[PDB]
Design goal:
527 residues, mainly alpha, motor protein, kinesin regulation protein
Length: 527
């Protein structure tokens, strides 16, 4: 009856190859094979003939993971074949994968560990490919336990084997490789890490088809920003003005040999033998910048060349996260001008101010309880108006001859102070300012205390020229400082940052004394 059996197989196969499209006469094949079971009659040969449908049977009873009967039959057959060549790995993987959602992850590990062990012990689609699925499923397990080093080894090794075959897809290459980047960023191995991102550019070059560029452009940002900010080792303000006192040593013989060993591992990724080499050629042409002392145009061009797709992502964001990239570009452009160590230009400050107006209108659009968005914007208000403070210091020191009208700039400073007091008065009204939002005590002390310290410095910045105003501001500063004394020394939370506490202790003595001085002026006036 073997011809009949084979015909029944091949007849059943196609319908399997498809309200659920199946389980439908998939029991008729069951009935026929089980009819074959009884008068099956060596014995091992007969048994081998069996487990095929049984495999499929367990496969059939998925029932969208709400079942169990398939589980039972599968484990039965697995015990059979255990006592009884690639079938074991073909099954054990899927048996485990359900328990993965059952979250017995540690136990599930042992299965895949055994599978790879069997691979290693042993030494056409299965022969050239099932290795793949185990490796892929392996990495996402590690994420929770955070051996990212170990996971990276697999992911990187997996991509190489993936290159043997013609299977390639843009998401599976890009969205994986790009995310792999940040790992080395933390390890600060830029010289090694460039290659991944840089090579990630041609595969995608050969819906999502548009929005995938977003992560691509984002990863560029983190590359630049760390490289600039690491240079902040030596600040002209707190470190000697002479720079590069120690030998620059841009090119070192000892360093290159060590690099080559790492480079050799990187070299292994290239395959295609020449087109990938040309890809890496263009790679290096833009790797053209490593470690600079003339950096200015190079880094600005970094931004600009990626500013293109920065804008593109802004297009591909619906008004919600556009602010995020806008303010990131804001900060970075500011940092370019800053670390570009020269005085006379305020242009990027002014342009940031315009962009800041631009991001302020959404407050009118959205008066939602966007607390920390408001906190953030007030923070860069502090920062920009500190830029005002410092440029004021610079101009005032630059006052060689008689001062022209910079009192307009001083009033700009005053309205900056007004904007600030509006912001921390928003914070007030949140706390004690209004009928809708009053509070018992300043129970929340830490973050508003650091904000209040900033405004303390601002009150110290009340130093202006006006005569009837000076007197009332003497009183205002004294009273504000006394408020602050109450806020901290007498709240008795004692969880307040003691470093600050002592800073405002210095400030409180520094306030006691010239309040006495102002008394002296007033009473010399009383004389």
């Amino acid at each position: 009856p073997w011809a009949e059996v084979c015909e029944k197989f091949q007849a059943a196969l196609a319908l399997s190859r498809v309200p659920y499209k199946s389980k439908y006469s998939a029991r008729a094949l069951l009935e026929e094979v089980k009819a074959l079971l009884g008068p099956a009659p060596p014995v091992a040969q007969r048994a081998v003939r069996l487990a095929v449908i049984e495999f499929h049977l367990g496969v059939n009873h998925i029932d969208t993971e709400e079942l169990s009967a398939g589980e039972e039959h599968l484990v039965k057959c697995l015990r059979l074949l255990r006592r009884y060549i690639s079938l074991c790995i073909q099954a054990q993987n899927n048996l485990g994968i359900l328990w993965s959602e059952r979250e017995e992850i540690e136990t599930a590990q042992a299965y895949l560990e055994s599978s790879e062990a069997l691979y290693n012990q042993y030494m056409s689609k299965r022969f050239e490919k099932v290795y793949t699925h185990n490796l892929y499923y392996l990495a996402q397990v590690y994420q929770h336990l955070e051996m990212f080093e170990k996971a990276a080894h697999y992911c990187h090794s997996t991509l190489k084997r993936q290159l043997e075959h013609n299977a390639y897809h843009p998401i599976e290459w890009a969205i994986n490789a790009a995310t792999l980047s940040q790992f080395y960023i933390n390890k600060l191995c830029f010289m090694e890490a460039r290659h991944c991102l840089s090579a990630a550019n041609v595969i995608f070059g050969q819906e999502l088809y548009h929005q995938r560029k977003g992560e691509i452009a984002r990863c560029w940002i983190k590359y630049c920003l760390t490289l600039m900010q690491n240079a902040q080792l030596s600040m002209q303000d707190n470190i000697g003005e002479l720079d590069l006192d120690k030998q620059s040593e841009l090119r070192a013989l000892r360093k290159k040999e060590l690099d080559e060993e790492e480079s050799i591992r990187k070299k292994a990724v290239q395959f295609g033998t020449g087109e990938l080499c040309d890809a890496i050629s263009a790679v290096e042409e833009k790797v053209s910048y490593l470690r600079p002392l003339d950096f200015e145009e190079a880094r600005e061009l970094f931004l600009l060349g990626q500013h293109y797709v920065f804008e593109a992502k802004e297009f591909f964001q619906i008004d919600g996260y556009v602010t995020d990239h806008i303010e990131v570009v804001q900060d970075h452009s500011a940092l370019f001008k800053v670390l570009a160590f020269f005085e006379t230009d305020m242009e990027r400050r002014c342009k940031m101010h315009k962009r800041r107006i631009a991001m302020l209108e959404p407050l009118t659009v959205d008066l939602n309880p966007q607390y920390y968005l408001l906190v953030n914007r007030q923070i860069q208000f502090e920062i920009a108006h500190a830029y005002y403070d410092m440029m004021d210091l610079k101009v005032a020191i630059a006052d060689r001859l008689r001062d022209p009208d910079s009192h307009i700039v001083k009033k700009i400073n005053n309205l900056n102070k007004s904007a600030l007091k509006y912001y921390q008065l928003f914070l007030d009204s949140l706390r004690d300012p209004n009928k809708v939002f009053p509070e018992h005590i300043g129970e929340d002390v830490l973050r508003p205390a650091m904000l209040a310290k900033f405004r303390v410095a601002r009150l110290y910045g009340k130093i202006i020229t006006a005569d009837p105003k000076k007197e009332l501001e003497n009183l205002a500063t004294s009273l504000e400082h006394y408020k602050f004394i109450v806020d901290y020394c007498e709240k008795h939370p004692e969880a307040a940052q003691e470093i600050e506490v002592e800073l405002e202790l210095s400030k409180e003595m520094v306030s006691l004394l010239p309040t006495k001085m102002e008394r002296f002026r007033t009473k010399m006036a009383l004389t």
